[PDB]
Design a protein around this ligand. Structure first.
Ligand SMILES: *[C@@H]1O[C@H](CO)[C@@H](O[C@@H]2O[C@H](CO)[C@@H](O[C@@H]3O[C@H](CO[C@H]4O[C@H](CO)[C@@H](O)[C@H](O)[C@@H]4O)[C@@H](O)[C@H](O[C@H]4O[C@H](CO)[C@@H](O)[C@H](O)[C@@H]4O)[C@@H]3O)[C@H](O)[C@H]2NC(C)=O)[C@H](O)[C@H]1NC(C)=O
Ligand SMILES: *[C@@H]1O[C@H](CO)[C@@H](O[C@@H]2O[C@H](CO)[C@@H](O[C@@H]3O[C@H](CO[C@H]4O[C@H](CO)[C@@H](O)[C@H](O)[C@@H]4O)[C@@H](O)[C@H](O[C@H]4O[C@H](CO)[C@@H](O)[C@H](O)[C@@H]4O)[C@@H]3O)[C@H](O)[C@H]2NC(C)=O)[C@H](O)[C@H]1NC(C)=O
Ligand SMILES: *[C@@H]1O[C@H](CO)[C@@H](O[C@@H]2O[C@H](CO)[C@@H](O)[C@H](O)[C@H]2NC(C)=O)[C@H](O)[C@H]1NC(C)=O
Ligand SMILES: *[C@@H]1O[C@H](CO)[C@@H](O[C@@H]2O[C@H](CO)[C@@H](O)[C@H](O)[C@H]2NC(C)=O)[C@H](O)[C@H]1NC(C)=O
Ligand SMILES: *[C@@H]1O[C@H](CO)[C@@H](O[C@@H]2O[C@H](CO)[C@@H](O)[C@H](O)[C@H]2NC(C)=O)[C@H](O)[C@H]1NC(C)=O
Ligand SMILES: CCOC(=O)c1cncn1[C@H](C)c1ccccc1
Ligand SMILES: CCOC(=O)c1cncn1[C@H](C)c1ccccc1
Ligand SMILES: CCCCCCCCCCCCCCCC
Ligand SMILES: CCCCCCCCCCCCCCCC
Ligand SMILES: CCCCCCCCCC
Ligand SMILES: CCCCCCCCCC
Ligand SMILES: CCCCCCCCCC
Ligand SMILES: CCCCCCCCCC
Ligand SMILES: CCCCCCCCCC
Ligand SMILES: CCCCCCCCCC
Ligand SMILES: CCCCCCCCCC
Ligand SMILES: CCCCCCCCCC
Ligand SMILES: NCCc1c[nH]cn1
Ligand SMILES: NCCc1c[nH]cn1
Ligand SMILES: [Cl-]
Ligand SMILES: [Cl-]
Ligand SMILES: [Cl-]
Ligand SMILES: [Cl-]
Lengths: 121, 334, 296, 121, 137, 121
C-alpha cells in the first residue's frame, strides 16, 4: 500500500525538476520508475531508481540528459529534466515496482501509479 | 479388475506420446491449477534472511492425450511414470535451495482421471529468501513470500491459477514457530514481463508477528536490572571511592555484553534497530551514574553539603527519568 | 539401530533403522523351487514397491556403501520382503516448560504418499512386537521410558490414507544439569553470603563480592541459553536462576542498607549483618525445598 | 489424554457464546475444532482454532457470523454464535486434533469429542 | 496446431543429429551471445573471500541443423530435450561451487526459432572467489 | 571380558528372586539376558535388561509374572520370579550381549554365560 504524489512539471520554452513523493509500505516496493505517455503512443520507460543504494537506470533517449535521484528522509524521488527537446512532450507518470515483479522496462510490472503531470515545450 | 486390460490401456496412452510437447501444443494455453498444503515452517533466519518451508505441492491440468475410456476409476500410477509424461516447468523464484523428498521413494504422485485430467503431487522442502525490515526489531512484522513461476513457458503456452481460489492453500494453522505467529496469509495471481516474454506468477504470502516474550526475559529485563544496580551507588557513602567506581564500571561494561550477545545472531545491517535504541538509552543512564560519582568526588572536600545534596537528588531523579524513558519508548514501539 | 542425536535447538532427532515391508504380489509367485529367492538389490528397480514416506522427516537417505542398503526376498506364494536401511532426521516439537525435568514424546509417522486406503492398507507386522531394538538406544542425555505403536486412517482433500505411528517417551537425565548448572548457581549464591561476615568498613570487599556474584549468574544463564531455541516462555531452569539472581542481588542491597546507616546507627547496622547470616541461608533453603518439590 | 466439557447452548429466538474447556495433554493436540450434526445429516465442520497462535478457520456458512477464540490460562475455547438462523439447528460438538492427524475439515481426524450441546432457534 | 505434424518436424530435426559435433564443425566458429539477469547477491564473505550470486544465464547461438519450415512459431520445448542437443561448454572460471536449480524440474529452457537460432536458459547459483584488499577496511 | 555369578534359585512348592552379579568390561556388553533350558528342549529366552536406562523386555510366557531389574552400584541384575508354575522348571542361565551382536531373543548372540541355577517346583 503505497501513495505517490508528483509535482514540478508546468510549461516552459531550459532545466526543470519533476519530483515524486511516496508514503506507506515502501520496503516491499524497493524501485521507483518514471514513465511518459505521448498522445497516441504506448506508455514508455524513462528511468528508475532504488530507494536503498540509489542504483539508477535510463532509457537511451534520455541518457546523458535527464538525471533521477531521491532522499529517503522525505520519501521523495526527483526527475531532473535538463537539455529538453520537443520530443519530450508527454504525460509523465511515477510508479512503484515490487521486489520480484520482473524487468524494469515494462509498465505492467508496476503497481502504484501517480496522477500524471502533463509537460509541453 | 483385469490388470492386462489396464496395462493395455496405459501402454496405449504412452504409445507415440511426445514428452517434448506441452498439452495442446501450438493451440490455447494449458491451464495449471495449484494447491499447497503447508507441512511446516521449520526455521526463520534473520542472519541469512531466509526461512525453510516444507509442503505438498499439487498441480492439476488437462492432457487429452491421457484421456481413457472403459474404466470408471481414477488411475493412481507408480511415481516413476512421471518421467514418461509432460509436466509443467514450475519453479520457486525466491528459493535459495530446494529438494523433493526421497525416502522411501521420490515423494511424488500421479493420478489420471478419464477425461485426461492429471493430478501431480510433490513433497518439497525449500529455503526461500525473506528480505526483512529490522528497523522495529524485535517488535517487527515481516512479510515472507513464496513466488511460483513458469520457467520457460510464457502466458501463450501456460496459465496458472489457485485451484479453489482463496481456499487453495491449507495447513497454515499447522505452522508452529516458537518466535512467531502467522497473522494473515494472502494469495495473488499476476503476469510478469521479462525480455523473453510474459510469464504467469502466483504468490503466497504470510505476515509474521515476532513474539516479544523471549526478548523481555533475555534482553529487556537484564538491561533494566543492570540500570537499577547502577543506582545502588547513590546510597553508598562518597568516601567509598573504590566501591562506587566498581558499581559504575561493572554496570557500564555489562551493557556491552548484552549488546554483543544480541548482535551475534543478526545480520550486519547499517541502521539502528528498536532494541539498539533501548540499549543506548540504558547505556547513557549507567554512564551518567558513574559521571555523577566523578562530580561528587570532585567537590566533596570543599563543598560536602552540595555533594550530599547531589547524591540525595540522584536517588529520585535517575529512577524517575528512567521510568519516563521507558514510558516514551514502549508507547512509540507498541 | 540407533538414535544418534536429539536437538532442542532444531527440535528434531536422528534415527537409523532397518525398515522391512512385506506384501503379496501374485505376479511374482513361482513353482518348482522349494527355496526363498534372495535376489541382488538392483532387482528392486524392476518391481512395484509401496510408496511409503516419513511424514515428519526433515531429511532422510538410504545408506549407500558398499551398495544401496536394500534387500528383496521372494517366497513361492508371491510374498515379497523388501528391506531398507534408512537414516532420517525427524521433527520433534518439544514442550520445554519443565526443562530440564521434562519428558518428550518423539514420533515417527509412516504414510502412503499417493495410494489411498482403496489401494493400500498398512499394519504392524507382529502387532506390538513389530518394532525391535528399543533397548539398543543409548542416548547419554535421555532414557526411553515407553514406546507405542498406533494405526489409523487420516483424511485429506485427495482422499483417506493409511498411517502408522511409532512413538517414544524420552525422560531427560538430570545429572548433567546438576553438575554444570544447578551446583554452580547454588555455590555462587553461597559465595554472596560470605559478604555478611566481612566487616562493614570493607566497602570495596563487600561490593566486589556482590558484583561478582550478580555478574556470574548472568554467565550461567548465557551459557545455558546458547544451546536452546528462542522460545517465548519461561523454563524450569530459568525459574531457578531468577530465584538465585534475586538472592544475590538482595545480598548486595543489604550492604547498601548497612552502608547507609552504620555511621548514625552502628548498633542497628551490626544487627542487620548478624540477622542476614541466618535469614539468607534459611530462605534459600526454603526456596530450594519449594522448587524441587514442585518440579520433581 | 484430553478431557473436553462444553457449555452455553440453550434455547433462544440474538447473540450467544458457546464455550469448551480442555484439560490434560493439550500440547500433543494443538488444534480445537467445532462441529455440528443436524438430525439425519452427516457431522459438519464449523471452525477450528490453534491453542498457540490463535490461527482460526471457518466453514463458508458461518463465515462473517460466528467467531471462535480461546484463553490458554483457563484452557478454554469459545464459539461466539452471532446473527443466528433456523439452519443453525444441530448438536454442536467440540473436538481435539493431533499434530500430524490430517486436514481440519474431516471429523474422523479428531480424537477427543465433547458431550454435544443441542441448540434450537 | 497439428501436434502430430510438430512431433514429425521435431523428430526430423533430431534424426541423425550428432551431439558430439558443434554447429558448423570444421568451419567458422559458432558465435554464442550471452545475457545475464541477476536475481540476487545473497552473501559476501570476507572470511572466505567469496560471494554468492544467483542468476538467469541465457545463451543464444545458431545451429542450422535445427532450422525448421512450415511453422510460423517459436518452439519452446520441454527442458529434457537439452540432453539431445549440442550446447556450449561454458563455465565460471572463478567459481568455487555452483549448481543449476532443480525444483520442480531442472531450471532450464530451450526455445528454437525457424532459422535454427537456439535460446538456452539456466538458473544458476554460484559461489565465486573475490580476493579482497582489506587495507582500508 | 565379563564374569557372571548367579544365586537365589533352590527348591520351593510362591515368590522368588534370582540374582546375577557381573564384573569386568560391562560397557562393551550393555545388555544382560535371562535364558532357561528345560530337559530335552532348546535354550529359551526369558527376558533382558540394559545396564544403562533399565530398558526391559520379556518372553510372552513370563509377561506379567516375572520382573527383571538391576543396580549399577553392585553390578548386579535380578530376576524376580513371582506366580510360579510347573512349566517354569529348567536350568536358568544369565548372559551378556555385545553392542552390535543382533536380536535379544537368540542365545548364540550372547558371549558370557553364567554357571546355570537349576529350579524345580
Ligand atoms: C506481502 O507483500 C506483497 C508485496 O510484495 C503484497 O502483494 C501485493 O498484494 C496485492 C493485494 O493485497 C496485489 O494486488 C492485486 O493484484 C492483482 C494482480 O494485478 C496485476 O495483474 C493484473 C493481471 O493479472 C492486472 O490487471 C493489474 O493491473 C496488475 O498488473 C489484481 O488483480 C488485484 O485486483 C483486485 O483487487 C483490488 C483491491 O486490492 C481492486 O481494486 C481490483 O478491482 C481487483 O478486484 C489486486 O490489485 C499486488 O499485485 C501484490 N504485489 C506484488 C508485488 O505481488 C502482499 O499482499 C503482502 N502479503 C501480505 C500477507 O501482507
Ligand atoms: C505420543 O503422542 C501421541 C499423540 O500425538 C499419542 O497418540 C495417540 O495414542 C492413542 C493410544 O495411546 C491412539 O489411540 C488409539 O487410536 C486407534 C486409532 O483410532 C482412530 O482410527 C480408527 C480407525 O483406524 C477409528 O475407529 C477411531 O475412531 C480413530 O479415528 C484406536 O483404534 C485405539 O482404540 C483402542 O484403544 C482404546 C483405548 O486406548 C479403546 O477405548 C478402544 O476400544 C480400542 O481398543 C486407540 O484409541 C491415538 O490415535 C493417538 N493419536 C494420534 C494423534 O496419533 C501416543 O500414544 C503418544 N505416545 C507415547 C509413547 O506416549
Ligand atoms: C476421480 O476423480 C475426480 C476428480 O477428483 C472425482 O470427481 C469429483 O467427485 C466429487 C464427488 O466425489 C465431486 O464433488 C467433484 O465435482 C468431482 N469432480 C469432477 C471434475 O468430476 C471422481 O469421483 C473420481 N472418479 C472415480 C471413478 O473415482
Ligand atoms: C521362506 O520364508 C517363509 C517366510 O519367512 C518361511 O516360512 C515360515 O517358516 C517358519 C518356520 O521356519 C514358520 O514359523 C512360519 O509360519 C512360516 N511362514 C509362512 C508364511 O510360511 C519358509 O520356511 C521359507 N521357505 C524356504 C523354502 O526356505
Ligand atoms: C521468435 O523469436 C524471435 C527472436 O526472439 C522473434 O523475432 C524478434 O521479434 C521482435 C518483434 O517481436 C523484433 O524486435 C526482433 O528484431 C526479432 N528478431 C529476429 C532475429 O527475428 C519472433 O517474433 C518470434 N517468432 C514467432 C513466430 O513468435
Ligand atoms: C551513548 C551511546 O553509546 C552506547 O550506547 C554504547 C557505547 N558502547 C557501548 N554502547 C552500547 C552498549 C551499545 C552499542 C551499540 C549498539 C547498542 C548499544
Ligand atoms: C530478578 C529477575 O532478574 C533476573 O533473573 C536477571 C536479570 N539479569 C539477569 N538475570 C538472570 C541471570 C536471568 C535472566 C534471564 C533468565 C533467567 C535468569
Ligand atoms: C507487551 C509490551 C512489553 C512492555 C514491557 C515493559 C517493561 C518496562 C519496565 C519499566 C522499568 C522501570 C524501572 C523502575 C524505576 C523506578
Ligand atoms: C533428583 C532431584 C534433584 C534435586 C537436587 C537438589 C539440590 C538442592 C540443594 C540445596 C542447597 C541449599 C544451600 C545451603 C543453605 C544452608
Ligand atoms: C567527559 C569527561 C569526564 C568528565 C567528568 C566530570 C567531572 C565533573 C566536572 C566539574
Ligand atoms: C528505585 C528506588 C527509588 C527510591 C527513591 C528514594 C526517595 C527517598 C525519599 C526520602
Ligand atoms: C513506570 C514504568 C512504565 C513502563 C512502560 C509500560 C509499558 C507500556 C506499554 C504500552
Ligand atoms: C526513532 C526514534 C525513537 C524514539 C523513542 C526512544 C526513546 C527516547 C526517549 C527520550
Ligand atoms: C532499588 C535502588 C537501590 C536502593 C538501595 C537501598 C539502600 C537503602 C535505602 C534506605
Ligand atoms: C550457610 C552458613 C549458615 C551459618 C549460620 C550462622 C549462625 C550463627 C549463630 C551464632
Ligand atoms: C536444605 C536443602 C533442601 C533442598 C531440597 C531437597 C530436594 C527435594 C527433592 C524432592
Ligand atoms: C510456575 C511456578 C513455579 C513455582 C516454583 C518456584 C519456586 C518459588 C518459591 C518462592
Ligand atoms: N520465467 C522467466 C525466467 C527469467 C527471469 N529473467 C529472465 N528470464
Ligand atoms: N499421503 C497424503 C499426502 C498429502 C498430504 N496433504 C495432501 N496430500
Ligand atoms: Cl533448488
Ligand atoms: Cl528425505
Ligand atoms: Cl580500597
Ligand atoms: Cl561447480
Amino acid at each position: 500500500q503505497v501513495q505517490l504524489v508528483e509535482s514540478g512539471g508546468g510549461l516552459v520554452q531550459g532545466s526543470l525538476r519533476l519530483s515524486c513523493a511516496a508514503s506507506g509500505h515502501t520496503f516491499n516496493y524497493p524501485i521507483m520508475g518514471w514513465f511518459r505517455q505521448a498522445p497516441g503512443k504506448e506508455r514508455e520507460f524513462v528511468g528508475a531508481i532504488s530507494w536503498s543504494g540509489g542504483s539508477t537506470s535510463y532509457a537511451d533517449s534520455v541518457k546523458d540528459r535527464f538525471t533521477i535521484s531521491r532522499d529517503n528522509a522525505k520519501n521523495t524521488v526527483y526527475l531532473e529534466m535538463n537539455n529538453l527537446k520537443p520530443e519530450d512532450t508527454a504525460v509523465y507518470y511515477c510508479a512503484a515496482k515490487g521486489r520480484y515483479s520482473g524487468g524494469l522496462y515494462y509498465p505492467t510490472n508496476y503497481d502504484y501509479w501517480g496522477q500524471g503531470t502533463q509537460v509541453t515545450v | 479388475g483385469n490388470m492386462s486390460f489396464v496395462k493395455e490401456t496405459v501402454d496405449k496412452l504412452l504409445k507415440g506420446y511426445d514428452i517434448r510437447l506441452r498439452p495442446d501444443f501450438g493451440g490455447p494455453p494449458v491451464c495449471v491449477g495449484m494447491n499447497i498444503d503447508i507441512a511446516s515452517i521449520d526455521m526463520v533466519s534473520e542472519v541469512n534472511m531466509d526461512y525453510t518451508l516444507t509442503m505438498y505441492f499439487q498441480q492439476y491440468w488437462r492432457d487429452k492425450r491421457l484421456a481413457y475410456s472403459g474404466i470408471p476409476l481414477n488411475l493412481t500410477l507408480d511415481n516413476r511414470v512421471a518421467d514418461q509424461l509432460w509436466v509443467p516447468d514450475t519453479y520457486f523464484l525466491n528459493d535459495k535451495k530446494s529438494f523433493v523428498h526421497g525416502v522411501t521413494v521420490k515423494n511424488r504422485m500421479i493420478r489420471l482421471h478419464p477425461d485426461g485430467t492429471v493430478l501431480y503431487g510433490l513433497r518439497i522442502t525449500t529455503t526461500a529468501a525473506c528480505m526483512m525490515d529490522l528497523r522495529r526489531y524485535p517488535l517487527d512484522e515481516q512479510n515472507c513470500t513464496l513466488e511460483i513461476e513458469s520457467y520457460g513457458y510464457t502466458t501463450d503456452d501456460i496459465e496458472f491459477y489457485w485451484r479453489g481460489g482463496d481456499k487453495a492453500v491449507t495447513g497454515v494453522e499447522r505452522i508452529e514457530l516458537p518466535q512467531f505467529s502467522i497473522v494473515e496469509h494472502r494469495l495473488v495471481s499476476r503476469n510478469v514481463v521479462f525480455a523473453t516474454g510474459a510469464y504467469p506468477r502466483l504468490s503466497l504470502s504470510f505476515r509474521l508477528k515476532r513474539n516479544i516474550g523471549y526478548f523481555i526475559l533475555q534482553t529487556y529485563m537484564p538491561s533494566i536490572l543492570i540500570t537499577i544496580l547502577s543506582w545502588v551507588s547513590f546510597w553508598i557513602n562518597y568516601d567509598a571511592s573504590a566501591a562506587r567506581v566498581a558499581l559504575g564500571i561493572t554496570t557500564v561494561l555489562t551493557m556491552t555484553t548484552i549488546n554483543t550477545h544480541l548482535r551475534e545472531t543478526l545480520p550486519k545491517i547499517p541502521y539502528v534497530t528498536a532494541i539498539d535504541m533501548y540499549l543506548m538509552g540504558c547505556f547513557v543512564f549507567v554512564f551518567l551514574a558513574l559521571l555523577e560519582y566523578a562530580f561528587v568526588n570532585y567537590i566533596f572536600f570543599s563543598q560536602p553539603a552540595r555533594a550530599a545534596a547531589i547524591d540525595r537528588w540522584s536517588r529520585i531523579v535517575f529512577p524517575f527519568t528512567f521510568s519516563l524513558f521507558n514510558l516514551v519508548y514502549w508507547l512509540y514501539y507498541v
